[PDB]
């Protein structure tokens, strides 16, 4: 049964147990995202959907926090804007300056959400440099430039839940965590190309195009 | 110079008192001509008065001859196409008072076949502008000597 | 560069995002101004309390009381102070930066006395 | 722009003729020269464009070393 809640002063109603981001979408409130997709399971790893709830001290993830009756959400205030700026700072810490040579240029969520919800300039100038990651060969259809991976886990979730291809996974730990087949394997499925569309960055791209 | 210092300031904060003044001024105009002024709008030292085509000549006479509103120089006449509106063309007028050093805007509406009154009877400078509006948009100005 | 914008520590962009802090365009139809007239303003309220004032506003949001009715019903102290000035006079076309002219004559002028062009500071 | 921070006079004429317009334009020559002198003497230091890279292109040495700078370059130029 539907409940009632307030988002930026607007009262909206959705079923109980729903995620907050769904309420914000029904209310016409735009909330950033990299790891949330309407058709994939909820992961809360990008930390870009953060919003302020009166109940909670810290900012909570819209993608995962359940909707409750009488909750008041703000997606406007200084804590949220600072949070988005900080998260994009960390996201673009080790991201490669491949925008000219990247095929996602012009249709990149990272570009657009850096322009909208992030800083104008970076403060990363470390002499030791950025992280590097080697490119994987997962077949003749999906081209890999895995320095651009932001570790959203959309590809893995798709391949393991919607397609039934459990060969793709999350190997390693920490900053050296790498998405791919731990050994050279192909992404054998008749649905592999949707990985190209699900990746909000150009880590997985169309090879003939 | 070692370090250049430039403060962070909002450019709109410079306008606030003038904005209130324009609001009061527009309220006076609306209260003096409630038959004609549909609305007014105010943004950053720009006041727009919102009227109908029948109300062009009266309101312009007021804006030309009234002592507190001596807008004597025609600046521009333009049209804008909003094809989602039932009355697609919005005919815009821009006026200046060198007496009081102030600008005002007046907006009406039109269609491809419904005309607007010409203000050439008041501002001779409107001739060429109204002609251009016809040539570019098709707005017919009724009363114009040579359109 | 300049200091408060080049700083690397206490310089969040949202504190200097002036584009997204742009001023809205206020629009006033005749309904909204008779509300300011029949009722008051947030600076000079003349509205009842609770639900009474709420549906008093609602009577203006819909066509209950008209603008001419509100002008006729308006006191002297409303008009003379919220429509006209305190002295009863109409307000002039406002000027953002008033410029008071001065004429330069004689030796500091551009052309001598005979010529038909003058100098205004 | 900066005309409130520089001293110049305005020429105004009677009789509305072409001679008065000519004299006005020559006075405007001389006042423009005055303004150019003052600006060459009082040219400040700092940036020449807004320091918001969401409106203006960043410098090249940041576009070729900073990720945000390159993103903003890309978007502003596309």
């Amino acid at each position: 049964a539907e409940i009632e809640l307030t988002i930026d002063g607007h009262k909206v109603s959705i079923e109980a147990g729903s995620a907050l981001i769904q309420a914000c979408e029904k209310a016409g409130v735009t909330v950033p995202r990299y790891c949330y997709h309407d058709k994939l399971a909820i992961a809360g790893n990008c930390r870009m959907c953060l919003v302020d709830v009166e109940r909670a001290p810290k900012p909570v993830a819209s993608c995962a926090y359940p909707v409750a009756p009488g909750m008041v959400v703000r997606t406007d205030t200084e804590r949220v804007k600072q949070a988005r700026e900080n998260v994009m700072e960390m996201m673009l810490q080790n991201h490669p300056l491949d925008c000219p040579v990247c095929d996602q240029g012009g249709e990149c969520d990272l570009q657009d959400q850096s322009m909208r919800y992030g800083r104008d300039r970076g403060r990363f100038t470390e002499i030791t440099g950025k992280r590097s990651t080697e490119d994987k060969n997962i077949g003749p259809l999906v081209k890999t430039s895995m320095n651009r991976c932001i570790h959203c886990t959309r590809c893995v979730r798709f391949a393991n839940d919607i397609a039934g291809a459990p060969e793709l996974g999350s190997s390693g730990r920490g900053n050296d965590m790498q998405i791919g087949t731990y050994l050279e394997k192909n992404l054998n499925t008749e649905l592999s190309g949707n990985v190209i569309d699900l990746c909000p960055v150009g880590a997985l791209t169309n090879k003939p195009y | 110079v070692d370090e250049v210092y430039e403060p962070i300031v909002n450019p709109a904060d410079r306008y606030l008192q003038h904005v209130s003044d324009l609001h009061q001024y527009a309220k006076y105009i609306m209260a003096a001509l409630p038959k004609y002024i549909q609305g007014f709008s105010v943004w950053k030292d720009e006041l727009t008065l919102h009227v109908a085509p029948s109300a062009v000549i009266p309101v312009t006479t007021f804006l030309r001859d009234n002592t507190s509103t001596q807008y004597k120089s025609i600046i521009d006449i333009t049209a804008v196409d909003y094809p989602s509106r039932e009355n697609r063309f919005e005919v815009v007028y821009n006026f200046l008072s060198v007496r009081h050093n102030s600008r005002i805007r007046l907006k009406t509406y039109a269609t491809e076949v419904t005309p607007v009154p010409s203000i050439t009877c008041l501002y001779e400078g409107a001739n060429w502008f109204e002609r251009e509006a016809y040539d570019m948009y098709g707005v017919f100005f009724e009363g114009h000597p040579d359109l | 560069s300049s200091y408060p914008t080049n700083d690397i520590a206490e310089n969040p962009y949202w504190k200097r995002d002036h584009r997204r802090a742009y001023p809205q365009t206020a629009f006033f139809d005749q309904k909204t101004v008779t509300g300011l007239l029949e009722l008051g303003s947030e600076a000079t309220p003349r509205i009842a309390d609770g639900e009474a004032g709420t549906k008093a506003l609602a009577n203006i949001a819909n066509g209950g009381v008209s603008f001419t009715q509100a002008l006729g019903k308006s006191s002297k102290d409303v008009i003379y102070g919220e429509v006209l000035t305190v002295n009863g006079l109409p307000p002039v076309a406002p000027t953002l930066a008033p410029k008071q002219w001065k004429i330069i004559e004689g030796e500091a002028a551009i052309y001598p006395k005979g010529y038909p062009c003058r100098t205004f500071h | 722009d900066a005309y409130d921070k520089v001293d110049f006079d305005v020429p105004v004429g009677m009789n509305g003729d072409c001679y008065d317009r000519y004299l006005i334009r020559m006075a405007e020559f001389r006042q423009s020269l005055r303004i150019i002198e003052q600006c060459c003497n009082d040219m400040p230091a700092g940036a020449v464009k807004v320091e918001d890279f969401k409106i203006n292109s960043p410098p090249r040495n940041l576009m070729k070393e900073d990720m945000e700078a390159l993103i903003h370059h890309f978007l502003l130029y596309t």
């Binding site: 012009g106 657009d112 | 209130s20 609001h23 | 809205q24 206020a26 600076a43 609770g50 506003l57 | -």
Partner: peptide, 29 residues
């Protein structure tokens, strides 16, 4: 123009009406 931004570029602005021209909120009770 097909490369227009898919994300909303600039939010709502800033209310710069004076308090003399905002309608009065009635006192709660």
């Amino acid at each position: 123009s097909a490369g227009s931004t898919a994300w909303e570029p600039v939010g709502p602005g800033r209310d710069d009406r004076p308090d003399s021209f905002k309608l009065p909120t009635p006192k709660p009770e």
